[PDB]
Design an enzyme around this catalytic site. Structure first.
Site, PDB file in Angstrom:
ATOM      1  N   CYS A 601       3.965   5.764 -11.575  1.00  0.00           N
ATOM      2  CA  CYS A 601       3.066   4.647 -11.323  1.00  0.00           C
ATOM      3  C   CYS A 601       2.264   4.247 -12.575  1.00  0.00           C
ATOM      4  O   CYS A 601       1.669   3.159 -12.626  1.00  0.00           O
ATOM      5  CB  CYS A 601       2.146   4.936 -10.126  1.00  0.00           C
ATOM      6  SG  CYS A 601       2.964   5.213  -8.523  1.00  0.00           S
ATOM      7  N   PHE A 652       3.949   2.684  -0.420  1.00  0.00           N
ATOM      8  CA  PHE A 652       4.891   2.111  -1.389  1.00  0.00           C
ATOM      9  C   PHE A 652       5.664   0.900  -0.893  1.00  0.00           C
ATOM     10  O   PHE A 652       6.175   0.904   0.222  1.00  0.00           O
ATOM     11  CB  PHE A 652       5.888   3.166  -1.838  1.00  0.00           C
ATOM     12  CG  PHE A 652       5.273   4.279  -2.609  1.00  0.00           C
ATOM     13  CD1 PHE A 652       4.408   4.013  -3.658  1.00  0.00           C
ATOM     14  CD2 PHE A 652       5.554   5.595  -2.291  1.00  0.00           C
ATOM     15  CE1 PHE A 652       3.834   5.036  -4.380  1.00  0.00           C
ATOM     16  CE2 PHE A 652       4.985   6.618  -3.007  1.00  0.00           C
ATOM     17  CZ  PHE A 652       4.119   6.338  -4.053  1.00  0.00           C
ATOM     18  N   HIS A 740      -4.377   0.242 -11.444  1.00  0.00           N
ATOM     19  CA  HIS A 740      -3.266   0.546 -10.562  1.00  0.00           C
ATOM     20  C   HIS A 740      -3.823   0.959  -9.203  1.00  0.00           C
ATOM     21  O   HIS A 740      -4.522   1.961  -9.098  1.00  0.00           O
ATOM     22  CB  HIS A 740      -2.409   1.680 -11.113  1.00  0.00           C
ATOM     23  CG  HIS A 740      -1.204   1.964 -10.277  1.00  0.00           C
ATOM     24  ND1 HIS A 740      -0.189   1.046 -10.107  1.00  0.00           N
ATOM     25  CD2 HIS A 740      -0.870   3.045  -9.532  1.00  0.00           C
ATOM     26  CE1 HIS A 740       0.729   1.561  -9.305  1.00  0.00           C
ATOM     27  NE2 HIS A 740       0.341   2.772  -8.943  1.00  0.00           N
ATOM     28  N   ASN A 773       1.705  -0.792  -2.809  1.00  0.00           N
ATOM     29  CA  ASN A 773       1.818  -0.133  -4.113  1.00  0.00           C
ATOM     30  C   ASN A 773       3.259  -0.264  -4.626  1.00  0.00           C
ATOM     31  O   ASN A 773       4.201   0.368  -4.128  1.00  0.00           O
ATOM     32  CB  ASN A 773       1.374   1.339  -3.974  1.00  0.00           C
ATOM     33  CG  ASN A 773       1.553   2.172  -5.253  1.00  0.00           C
ATOM     34  OD1 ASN A 773       2.248   1.786  -6.192  1.00  0.00           O
ATOM     35  ND2 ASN A 773       0.940   3.352  -5.260  1.00  0.00           N
TER      36      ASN A 773
END
Lengths: 828, 828
Positions: A601, A652, A740, A773
Site C-alpha cells: 500500500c 480492499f 493513504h 482502499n
C-alpha cells in the site's frame, strides 16, 4: 653592435686533427687513471684501457664489413660499451648514430634505414625490435651481454668478440686520410620543422666545440682531471655525448656511468665515487630537492651542478644551494644543429665571471652570434629580442641527404638559424624567451539532465464496472463464499463493514466468476494459477484505461513519453505488466520501464519518488506512472481464525490511476498540477510483520497487527519534521494533506496525534468512502480529487488554496513514504 | 523664486458659504436638466430632484438621531444614493465618511469606530460585515435596495424611508449656524507615514478647492453644463468626490454613474449618453487602447480624457490621440490632505495653456506652492527637485483627533508637506519624481541534485558453497530427479551440457533438500510454497554476503548509504528482500529502497540504470545495488516435451553481486572503477514470449524460443548506434565489452554479427565458464572480473586499457538494456 662574442679570448683550436687524436692528445698524462666507471658494478676502464680497446674494436669493425664513411648504430642505455663503440667508430673513420632503446621497431627501423646503418650495438632484450634489419636487410648485430651461460639470439655476436686482438686489421691503423669534414657523429633531431632529420657533425666540428668548452687557460667549462663527472643523462642525446663524454675525456676526467636513474642509487654513487660534476635535468634536481634522503649521504664532493636542456625555477636553485653549499649552478644553451653548444655559463670558467639568474650563459668563443629580426635580415642590438643565429666551425656540416633544409636553416653567409628567440644584455649573458611557434563527461552530463522540479502534468483514473455497496456487502460475501452457515462471524463482519467508512467499492471479481472458480472463494484451496490468469490479463487493461485518460488530458503525442513506471501488487510474470501496457498504448519500444511488483500500500509514494528522479535527471523526460490494483489476488473466504483477512475483505477494492510527470513544462499546452519537491522513505523498527503478505499456492495472503494505527501515529511526526525542517515549516495544518486511507482507524489515529483540523483529511476520506482502499493507486486518486475540488471551488492553488503539501504511503514492514508537494497557483 | 503661483489670476472664492449653498448657488439655471444619470439603468435625477431629496434626507437624518457635527458613513459602490447621502450629510451640518464595500469587517469596523459613525448607508449584501456595529454598538443601518418583494436583514431601513417628506424636521432647515471650519467630509488616507488617518475637510476647504478648479472666467478645469462627466472611479476616494461630483454639480453638468467598470459597458455608455469628460485610471485607458472594440462605437463625443492618480506612458497618450482625436489629455496632482487638488493641467482651461508630456500640471490658483530641501527648511528654485509644499484655504483642517501628525505634516507657517518630491520648470508646469522612500524551488532543487556522473565505487560477489561441475551434471541431475529411466533424454542433456560452455556452477539446492522435498524435483508437482520458503530466507543472506564484500572495499560507514536497490528473480513477499537485507546490514531505516521482483536476465542493466538516476539526482547519495539469484525458484525435473526447460537447467546457477554507485567521489579514500554515462532500454517487436516465465503452483516455469540468439543479433547494432552516435563512435571493437552471457549461442551470434575481435567477450565468457548464468548478477560479476584483470595486467584503464564501454542485459520479452560506461585511468 651587429655581432656578439664571448668575454673570453679566442683560443687555438687544432681542428685539423681527427676527433680521437684530439680527445686523446694528452693521454700520456692520464694513462693509468680511471676513465670510465660503471657506477652500479664498480668496473673501471682506465685511459690506456679505453684507447687500446677502442682501437681493437675499430679493427674488428673492419672485419665485420664496416668501411670508412659508412654508419654504425648504437641502441643502448648508458654503459662503457657505448663510449668504446663511439670512439671505435671514430678510430675506423666510420660514423656513429644512436637511438633510444625505448623507441619502437618503427622509429628505429626508420632511423636505421634513413642513415644506412651497416651494424648495430645493442643489448639482448632489444634484439626483436631489429629482427627485420638483421634478417632481410643483412645488418650485423652485436650484444653487450657478458653472461656466457645465457645465450643470445642467434645470428648475434658477443661484444667481447670485438675487443679481441687481431694485428692484421691494425694495418688499418689508417687512413692517413681522415678529413676534418668527414662525418663522425650522426644524431637525429626533433628538427626546426616537423619530421626528424639526421645531423652531420664532423671531426673538425666536434673538436671545435669541445675546445670551445674545456680548452684555454681559462676554460669556459672548467674540468680538472681529478673531476668525476656523472653521466646519468642519455648518451644517445648529443648533449651527454659532447659535454660529458667528449669533454670529460679530453680533460682526463673520470666518467661515472649510470645506466638508470633512481634517487637513492644516485645519492649512494655520489657519496661513494665522490662525483664532482653533476650534469642533470630539472626532474632529477626536483627529485633531489624534494627528498629528505639527502641528510644521510655526504654530498660535499659535488662542486658543479649543471643543467643541460633544463631551466631551474629559482625555487630549486635555493634548494640546491642549501643541499650543496659548494656547488656552482648554471645552464648551457644547446641545439643539435649547433654542434650542440652555443652558450655556456661563464660562472663555470676556471676564473669565473658573474652570472644572473635565468640566464643561459654567454656565447662560446671562436664563434660569433647575432640577433636577427624574423622575416627581415636586420641585426638587432642589446636587450632586443630576436631569432638567435650563430656562426663558427663547431656547427653542423648539414642535414644528411637534405640540402633543402640544410640551406633553409644554415644561410648563405654561414649563419645557423636556431628558430629560437632571445636577447643579450649589457653583461653579454644571453636570455631565452620563446620559439617560432607563436563533448565530455562534465558537459554531456549537464546536457543530459533536466533543469526544474518534477511536476505532475496529468492524472486519470479507471475502475471496474462491477460495483458493490457496503450496505450490501456482508450479505453478498457470506453468500458468494458459501459461508452463510457461520452466523457468529457474519454478525462481526457486519460491524466491520459499518465501522469501515466505505460506502461503495469497484470490484472486478463477480459472483459468476466464483461460480466458475470456487477455489477462489474457498478460505484455503489452491487458487494461485487461476488468480494469476485473471490479474495478468486484467491489470494491464484497467491500467490502459486510466493511462489513456491521463494522456488525453496531457494532450501531447505518446512518442513523447520516455519512461513508464508500472506498479501492481501481484500478477508477476515476464515479460511483465510494463511490457504489456506499453504495447497496449503503442508507446515507443525505447520507453524505459520500471516494473514494481509486490510493493504494498506504500507504493503510491514509491512511484512518485521513482518518477521524480527519472524526470529530474533526464532532459525532456516525460514519465507515465500507472498503478493498477485488482483484488482477485487477495480475495478469499472467511475463517473464524484470521480476522485480519476479514478486515481486509471489507477494505480492499480494485482501481487504477495514471500520472504524467515531467520537468520543465512547456506552458504552451501543458498545465502543471503539483510539484514533487522532496521524496523520502523509512521503515519502522520491530514492525516487520505488522502489515505483511505471502504469495502461496492459495493466492496472496495478508496479515495485520491491531497496532498498525498506533505504530504509524508514533512515527508520522518525525517523518514530517524530517521532510519540512529544511523548509522551515512547523505548522502541519498549513499543509494540504494526502494520506493513504489504509483504514479509517489509521486516519483517525494520525489526525488525533497531530491535532489536524477536521477538514485536512477530507479529500482522503472522500476517496476512501467512494472507492475503498485501492492500495497504491489511492493517493493518486486523492490528488485528482484535491485538484478537481480546488478548481471547482475557485481556490488560490491546486492544493486546497495552500502552498505546501504532504503525501503519505503506508505499507507492510511499516515502510512509510513521505513526499513533499508544492501546489500550483490558479488564475482565478 | 521662493514661492510659486498659478498662471491664472486669483479669483473670488465665497468660502464663507456652506458647501451645499455654494455647489447649488446657481441651481436656478440648471433646475430641470439632468444631474445624476445612473448609467446602466437609465434613471435620471434632475438638479431640482437632487436638491429637494437631499434636503428631505437631511431632515430624516435628524429623525434617526444624527445631529450636527456627528458622522455618517457611506459603504457603497458608485450610485445616485451615494451623492444624495453625501449632500444630505452636508445639508444637516453633519459629516460624511466613506469606505470601500470590498473591505473587510475588520478595516470597516476599525474606520467606523475611529470616526464615531452614528449611521451607515450600504447595500444589502454588505450588511453582515457591519452586523457587530448594528447590534452591540447601536449604529443605524440603511439599505439602498429598492426591491420591495425581497426583504432586507432585520433592523435595517429602506433608503426609500429617508426620501419621505416630513415638514417638522424641516424646521431644521438650519442651523443659521453652519461654519466654514465645520467638518463635512472625512476621508481616510494611506497616510504620510503608516497607519490610516482620518482627514478633516471643511466647508471652507472644499468650496475653496472646487472654486480653484471650475470657477473663474478662465477655469483651470473647464466644464460646461452641457457636459456629461463619467464617474466610473470610486466615489469613496476623495478624487472622484471632489473633481467629479462636487465640481460637476457646481457647473450644472450631468454625472454618468457607473457602479462597475467593464470595457464594453463603458464604450456603450459613452456612445449612448454622449459622455464628454472621462476621468479614468491607467488600467482603464490601457484596456481601451488595447481593445479592437473601439472601431464599432462612436466615441467622438469625449472631449476630455483626464487621468487622476495615474500617469500615461506616452505610448498610451498616442493610442488615445488616435482613438479620440477630439480629446485633450492631462493629469491633476492630488493628495487627500491637500484637499485633494494641488496642481491641475492648464491644458484643461477654457482658454488653454501649452502643456508638456509627463507634467503634472500647474499649481492651482488662490494658493501658494514651494519646493523645500528635505531636512532643511530652505526653499529651492526652478528645476531643482525637492519636497513639495502647498498653502491655501483648500487644504485639510487636520487629522482628526491626532494633533501630533497634524503638526508634523502641516507646519507652523501653514505649509502642508506632501512627502513627495518634484521640480517646477520655467513654464510653471510641475513634475513628479519620487517619494520620501529612498530557499525556493529553483534553488532547493539545485542544492538537492548532485554534480557529476554516477560512478561505481566498489563491487563484491558471493556464491553458495555447494558447487557442481558440468562434467558431472547430466548424471547428477537425472540422478536426483529420479529420471534415470529416460535414456534418450539423458543422452540429449549430455550434449546440451557440453555445448553449454559452462565448467562449474554454484548452487544452493542440494541432493539432501530434494530427498526432503521431492516435489521440487518432480517435473510438475506443486512446489511453490516450499520454494518460496527457501528463497525468501536465502536470497537476502547471499545478498548480504556480497553487499558486505562491496562495503568493505568501499571503506566508509554504512550510515552513508542512502539508497538500496535490490533485484531478485523471485521470492516475492512483503515486506520484501529490500527490507530484509537492510536489517541484516544494519542500514539506516531512512534508506530509500527499490524492490525489483520478477525482472529477468536483463535486470543487470536495469539496476545500473536505476542507480545512475538515484545517484546523479541526490547530493551525496551513495547507492547500494544488490542482485541475488537462487535457482531453487527455477529448478525442476525433465520432460521429453519441454526442451527449453532442459537447456535452462543446464545454464542457470546461483550467485550474488553488490555494487556501490555514487556521484562526486571524494578521492580521499574512494576509488572510482567505472562511470555510468548513458542508460537505455528497448523491447523488440513480436518477441514477447521468446524469453518468458510464469509463476504457477509448480514454481516459476520458463520458456525459450530457438531464435533468441538471432533476435538479439538483429537489434544489437541499432542499440549501439543509438547509444554511441551522440558520442561519435562507430567502431565497436574499440569498446570494452560486457554482455549478459544468456547462453553461449547468444554471444557467438552477437560477435559474428558485429565482427568482434575474438577477445572482446573474453571476460564475459570467463564469468559464464566459471559461474554459469546468474541472471541479473552476471554483468556485475563481469565488471568485477574486467577491472581485476585490467589491474592484474597493468593496463591504462579499468576498462581493459580502453576508454569507452558497453554493458548489455538481455531478457524475456526481449527487453534489452544498453548501458554506456567510461573506464577509469589507472596510475601505472
Amino acid at each position: 653592435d651587429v655581432i656578439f662574442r664571448s668575454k673570453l679570448p679566442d683560443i687555438y683550436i687544432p681542428n685539423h686533427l681527427s676527433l680521437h687524436d684530439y680527445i686523446f692528445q694528452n693521454i700520456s698524462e692520464f694513462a693509468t687513471k680511471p676513465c670510465l666507471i660503471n657506477g652500479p658494478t664498480g668496473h673501471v676502464y682506465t685511459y690506456s684501457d679505453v684507447h687500446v680497446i677502442s682501437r681493437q674494436i675499430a679493427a674488428n669493425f673492419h672485419k665485420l664489413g664496416v668501411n670508412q664513411n659508412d654508419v654504425v648504430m648504437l641502441l643502448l642505455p648508458n654503459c662503457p660499451e657505448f663510449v668504446l663503440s663511439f670512439l671505435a667508430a671514430s678510430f675506423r673513420g666510420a660514423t656513429a648514430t644512436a637511438a633510444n632503446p625505448f623507441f619502437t621497431p618503427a622509429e628505429i627501423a626508420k632511423q636505421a634505414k634513413a642513415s644506412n646503418t651497416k651494424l648495430i650495438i645493442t643489448e639482448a632484450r632489444y634484439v626483436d625490435k631489429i629482427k627485420p634489419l638483421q634478417n632481410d636487410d643483412g645488418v650485423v648485430i652485436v650484444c653487450i651481454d657478458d653472461n656466457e651461460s645465457v645465450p643470445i639470439p642467434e645470428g648475434c655476436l658477443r661484444f667481447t668478440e670485438l675487443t679481441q686482438s687481431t694485428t692484421e686489421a691494425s694495418e688499418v691503423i689508417d687512413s692517413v686520410e681522415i678529413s676534418p669534414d668527414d662525418v663522425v657523429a650522426l644524431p637525429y633531431s626533433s628538427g626546426t620543422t616537423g619530421l626528424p632529420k639526421g645531423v652531420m657533425l664532423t671531426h673538425k666540428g666536434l673538436v671545435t666545440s669541445v675546445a670551445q668548452q674545456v680548452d684555454g687557460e681559462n676554460p669556459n667549462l672548467y674540468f680538472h682531471s681529478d673531476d668525476v663527472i656523472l653521466c646519468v643523462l642519455p648518451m644517445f642525446h648529443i648533449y651527454a655525448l659532447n659535454s660529458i663524454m667528449l669533454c670529460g675525456l679530453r680533460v682526463g676526467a673520470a666518467i661515472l656511468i649510470m645506466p638508470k636513474f633512481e634517487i637513492n642509487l644516485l645519492l649512494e654513487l655520489i657519496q661513494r665515487c665522490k662525483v664532482t660534476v653533476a650534469p642533470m635535468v630539472p626532474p632529477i634536481v626536483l627529485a633531489i630537492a624534494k627528498s629528505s634522503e639527502t641528510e644521510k649521504y655526504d654530498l660535499s664532493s659535488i662542486r658543479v651542478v649543471k643543467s643541460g636542456a633544463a631551466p631551474l625555477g629559482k625555487e630549486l636553485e635555493d634548494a640546491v644551494n642549501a643541499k650543496f653549499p659548494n656547488a656552482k649552478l648554471g645552464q648551457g644553451y644547446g641545439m643539435t644543429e649547433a654542434g650542440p653548444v652555443l652558450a655556456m655559463s661563464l660562472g663555470f670558467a676556471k676564473e669565473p665571471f658573474p652570472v644572473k639568474s635565468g640566464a643561459c650563459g654567454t656565447v662560446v668563443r671562436n664563434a660569433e652570434m647575432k640577433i636577427v629580426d624574423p622575416d627581415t635580415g636586420d641585426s638587432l642590438s642589446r636587450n632586443q629580442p630576436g631569432e638567435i643565429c650563430i656562426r663558427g666551425h663547431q656547427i653542423m656540416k648539414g642535414y644528411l641527404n637534405n640540402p633543402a633544409a640544410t640551406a633553409e636553416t644554415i644561410d648563405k653567409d654561414g649563419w645557423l638559424h636556431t628558430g629560437d628567440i632571445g636577447l643579450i644584455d649589457d653583461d653579454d649573458e644571453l636570455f631565452i624567451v620563446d620559439r617560432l611557434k607563436e563533448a565530455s563527461v562534465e558537459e554531456f552530463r549537464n546536457a543530459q539532465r533536466a533543469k526544474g522540479p518534477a511536476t505532475i502534468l496529468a492524472i486519470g483514473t479507471a475502475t471496474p464496472d462491477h460495483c458493490v455497496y457496503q450496505s450490501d456487502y456482508a450479505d453478498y460475501y457470506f453468500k458468494v463464499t458459501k459461508s452463510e452457515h457461520m452466523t457468529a462471524l457474519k454478525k462481526k463482519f457486519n460491524r466491520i463493514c459499518d465501522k469501515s467508512m466505505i460506502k461503495k467499492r469497484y470490484i472486478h471479481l463477480t459472483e459468476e466468476m466464483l461460480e466458475e472458480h470456487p477455489n477462489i472463494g474457498a478460505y484455503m484451496a489452491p487458487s494461485l494459477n487461476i488468480r494469476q490468469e485473471i490479474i495478468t490479463a486484467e491489470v494491464p487493461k484497467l491500467g490502459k484505461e486510466a493511462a489513456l485518460k491521463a494522456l488525453k488530458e496531457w494532450g501531447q503525442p505518446k512518442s513523447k513519453i520516455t519512461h513508464l513506471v508500472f506498479c501492481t501488487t501481484s500478477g508477476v510474470e515476464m515479460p511483465g505488466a510494463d511490457y504489456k501496457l506499453a504495447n497496449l498504448l503503442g508507446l515507443e519500444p525505447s520507453v524505459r520501464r520500471v516494473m514494481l511488483y509486490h510493493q504494498g500500500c506504500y507504493a503510491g509514494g514509491t512511484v512518485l519518488r521513482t518518477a521524480k528522479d527519472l524526470a529530474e535527471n533526464n532532459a525532456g523526460a516525460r514519465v507515465l506512472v500507472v498503478c493498477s490494483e485488482i483484488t482477485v489476488v487477495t480475495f478469499r473466504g472467511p475463517s473464524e481464525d484470521a480476522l485480519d483477512s476479514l478486515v481486509g475483505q471489507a477494505l480492499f477494492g480494485d482501481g487504477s490511476a495514471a500520472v504524467i510527470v515531467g520537468s520543465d513544462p512547456d506552458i504552451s499546452i501543458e498545465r502543471p498540477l503539483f510539484q514533487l519537491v522532496s521524496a523520502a522513505q523509512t521503515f519502522i523498527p520491530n514492525s516487520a510483520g505488522a502489515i505483511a503478505g505471502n504469495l502461496r499456492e492459495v493466492g496472496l495472503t495478508f496479515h495485520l497487527w491491531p497496532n498498525v494505527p498506533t505504530l504509524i501515529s508514533e512515527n508520522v511526526e518525525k517523518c514530517l519534521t524530517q521532510a519540512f525542517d529544511p523548509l522551515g515549516i512547523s505548522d502541519w495544518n498549513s499543509l494540504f494533506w494526502i494520506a493513504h486511507p489504509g483504514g479509517p482507524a489509521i486516519l483517525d489515529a494520525v489526525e488525533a496525534k497531530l491535532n489536524l483540523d477536521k477538514k485536512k483529511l477530507e479529500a482522503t476520506r472522500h476517496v476512501l468512502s467512494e472507492y475503498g482502499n485501492m492500495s497504491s493507486a489511492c493517493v493518486l486518486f486523492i490528488l485528482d480529487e484535491m485538484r478537481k475540488k480546488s478548481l471547482k471551488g475557485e481556490r488560490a492553488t491546486t492544493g486546497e488554496g495552500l502552498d505546501w503539501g504532504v503525501l503519505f504511503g503506508f505499507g507492510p514492514g511499516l515502510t512509510i513514504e513521505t513526499v513533499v508537494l508544492h501546489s500550483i497557483p490558479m488564475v482565478t
